Scaffold this active site. Structure first.
Site, PDB file in Angstrom:
ATOM      1  N   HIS A  62       0.659  -1.217   0.000  1.00 44.06           N
ATOM      2  CA  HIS A  62       0.000   0.000   0.000  1.00 44.06           C
ATOM      3  C   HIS A  62       0.713   1.317   0.000  1.00 44.06           C
ATOM      4  O   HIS A  62       0.125   2.322  -0.373  1.00 44.06           O
ATOM      5  CB  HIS A  62      -1.151   0.080   0.954  1.00 44.06           C
ATOM      6  CG  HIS A  62      -0.803  -0.109   2.368  1.00 44.06           C
ATOM      7  ND1 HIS A  62      -0.825  -1.317   2.988  1.00 44.06           N
ATOM      8  CD2 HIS A  62      -0.394   0.757   3.276  1.00 44.06           C
ATOM      9  CE1 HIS A  62      -0.488  -1.174   4.240  1.00 44.06           C
ATOM     10  NE2 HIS A  62      -0.148   0.062   4.413  1.00 44.06           N
ATOM     11  N   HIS A  92       6.346   7.311   5.395  1.00 49.57           N
ATOM     12  CA  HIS A  92       5.772   6.857   4.129  1.00 49.57           C
ATOM     13  C   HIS A  92       5.087   8.051   3.469  1.00 49.57           C
ATOM     14  O   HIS A  92       4.921   9.072   4.107  1.00 49.57           O
ATOM     15  CB  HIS A  92       4.791   5.666   4.303  1.00 49.57           C
ATOM     16  CG  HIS A  92       3.627   6.043   5.148  1.00 49.57           C
ATOM     17  ND1 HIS A  92       3.598   5.835   6.519  1.00 49.57           N
ATOM     18  CD2 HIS A  92       2.450   6.651   4.819  1.00 49.57           C
ATOM     19  CE1 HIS A  92       2.435   6.299   6.993  1.00 49.57           C
ATOM     20  NE2 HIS A  92       1.739   6.791   5.967  1.00 49.57           N
ATOM     21  N   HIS A  94       1.717   9.283   0.643  1.00 53.44           N
ATOM     22  CA  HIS A  94       0.501   9.054  -0.119  1.00 53.44           C
ATOM     23  C   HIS A  94       0.620   9.958  -1.356  1.00 53.44           C
ATOM     24  O   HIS A  94       1.104  11.101  -1.240  1.00 53.44           O
ATOM     25  CB  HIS A  94      -0.746   9.425   0.680  1.00 53.44           C
ATOM     26  CG  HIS A  94      -0.814   8.718   2.000  1.00 53.44           C
ATOM     27  ND1 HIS A  94      -1.527   7.565   2.150  1.00 53.44           N
ATOM     28  CD2 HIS A  94      -0.201   9.000   3.193  1.00 53.44           C
ATOM     29  CE1 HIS A  94      -1.375   7.161   3.436  1.00 53.44           C
ATOM     30  NE2 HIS A  94      -0.581   8.011   4.063  1.00 53.44           N
ATOM     31  N   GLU A 104      -3.720  13.641   1.573  1.00 52.76           N
ATOM     32  CA  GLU A 104      -4.845  13.148   2.391  1.00 52.76           C
ATOM     33  C   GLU A 104      -5.538  14.329   3.054  1.00 52.76           C
ATOM     34  O   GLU A 104      -6.734  14.571   2.816  1.00 52.76           O
ATOM     35  CB  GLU A 104      -4.288  12.147   3.421  1.00 52.76           C
ATOM     36  CG  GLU A 104      -3.792  10.893   2.695  1.00 52.76           C
ATOM     37  CD  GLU A 104      -3.923   9.651   3.573  1.00 52.76           C
ATOM     38  OE1 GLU A 104      -3.372   9.628   4.698  1.00 52.76           O
ATOM     39  OE2 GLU A 104      -4.596   8.691   3.095  1.00 52.76           O
ATOM     40  N   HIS A 117       4.099  11.251   5.727  1.00 47.66           N
ATOM     41  CA  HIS A 117       3.758  10.952   7.111  1.00 47.66           C
ATOM     42  C   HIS A 117       4.967  10.377   7.863  1.00 47.66           C
ATOM     43  O   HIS A 117       5.425   9.301   7.474  1.00 47.66           O
ATOM     44  CB  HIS A 117       2.600   9.923   7.165  1.00 47.66           C
ATOM     45  CG  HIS A 117       1.318  10.523   6.701  1.00 47.66           C
ATOM     46  ND1 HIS A 117       0.197   9.829   6.338  1.00 47.66           N
ATOM     47  CD2 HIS A 117       1.006  11.846   6.563  1.00 47.66           C
ATOM     48  CE1 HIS A 117      -0.770  10.645   5.988  1.00 47.66           C
ATOM     49  NE2 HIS A 117      -0.314  11.897   6.121  1.00 47.66           N
ATOM     50  N   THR A 196      -4.829   6.664   8.910  1.00 47.21           N
ATOM     51  CA  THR A 196      -5.645   6.858   7.702  1.00 47.21           C
ATOM     52  C   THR A 196      -5.737   5.566   6.882  1.00 47.21           C
ATOM     53  O   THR A 196      -6.365   5.525   5.812  1.00 47.21           O
ATOM     54  CB  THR A 196      -5.147   7.993   6.813  1.00 47.21           C
ATOM     55  OG1 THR A 196      -3.846   7.638   6.349  1.00 47.21           O
ATOM     56  CG2 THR A 196      -5.082   9.311   7.601  1.00 47.21           C
TER      57      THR A 196
HETATM   58 ZN   LIG Z   1      -0.031   7.809   5.964  1.00 48.33          ZN
END
Ligand SMILES: [Zn+2]
Length: 258
Positions: A62, A92, A94, A104, A117, A196
């Protein structure tokens, strides 16, 4: 079969396996900058990353996570709205399929190209698995990415992604200094929220930095070449691995600045 970001298993579906998805303190949220409350009692952030020890980079299906040694107080976050010491365990990102989406959190409904993050856990709980069961267990530093100039300190991460293209692959990743990912200013917004991704536990103090960092289109292009799938499976590009904004409900966002 399992959660993800596709049409049949994406964020709108998560509540069936994880009912806390419709909870009272879910993340991310839209940051309404005119409704956020300046709080003078908020302290500056204290980021102490000089002794950080990175170990490994992993494609978990992911995202990709850069993991640190958190067996000692080497890379810690203190201050701000926090009580106590929080140890860095992993960071990590997104990101989107296109430059106009991928973050996000949003700011006045503005989306950024990506969001970083940095995840930390409260040492009073002894280990990360205990910390996520506590309302003050995690602190996540969120940093927005905008496309423009390249970010020199990100290039070592971009250059290793080819070696972890598919789910379950990892590579040694030592001597990475996460100080190279911070913006000049540490002004922030903060609110109580959640992870999240599943299990979406409501254990996070979010600290979202006002100032974005800039990365180049070529850098973020390489993120978009990763795969959600395992080796030998049908190729699905790892893009749009972001959850949309959730209702703020009974929460106030506080700002460290005016
Ligand atoms: Zn995250």
């Amino acid at each position: 079969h399992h959660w993800g970001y596709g049409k049949h298993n994406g964020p709108e579906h998560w509540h069936k396996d994880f009912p806390i998805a419709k909870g009272e303190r879910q993340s991310p949220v839209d940051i309404d900058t005119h409704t956020a409350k300046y709080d003078p009692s908020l302290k500056p952030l204290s980021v102490s990353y000089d002794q950080a020890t990175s170990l490994r980079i992993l494609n978990n299906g992911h995202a990709f996570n850069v993991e640190f040694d958190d067996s000692q107080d080497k890379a810690v976050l203190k201050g701000g709205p926090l009580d106590g010491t929080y140890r860095l365990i992993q960071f990590h990102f997104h990101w989107g399929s296109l430059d106009g989406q991928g973050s996000e959190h949003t700011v006045d409904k503005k989306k950024y190209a990506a969001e970083l993050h940095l995840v930390h856990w409260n040492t009073k709980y002894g280990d990360f698995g205990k910390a996520v069961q506590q309302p003050d267990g995690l602190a996540v530093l969120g940093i927005f990415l905008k496309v423009g100039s390249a970010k020199p300190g990100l290039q070592k991460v971009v250059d290793v992604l080819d070696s972890i293209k598919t789910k379950g692959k990892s590579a040694d990743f030592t001597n990475f200094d996460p100080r190279g990912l911070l913006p000049e200013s540490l002004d922030y917004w903060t609110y109580p929220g959640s992870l999240t991704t599943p299990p979406l536990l409501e254990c996070v103090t979010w600290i979202v930095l006002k100032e974005p960092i800039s990365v180049s289109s070529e850098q973020v292009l390489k993120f978009r070449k990763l795969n959600f799938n395992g080796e030998g499976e049908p190729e699905e590009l790892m893009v749009d691995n972001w959850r949309p904004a959730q209702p703020l409900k009974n929460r106030q966002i506080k700002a460290s600045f005016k």
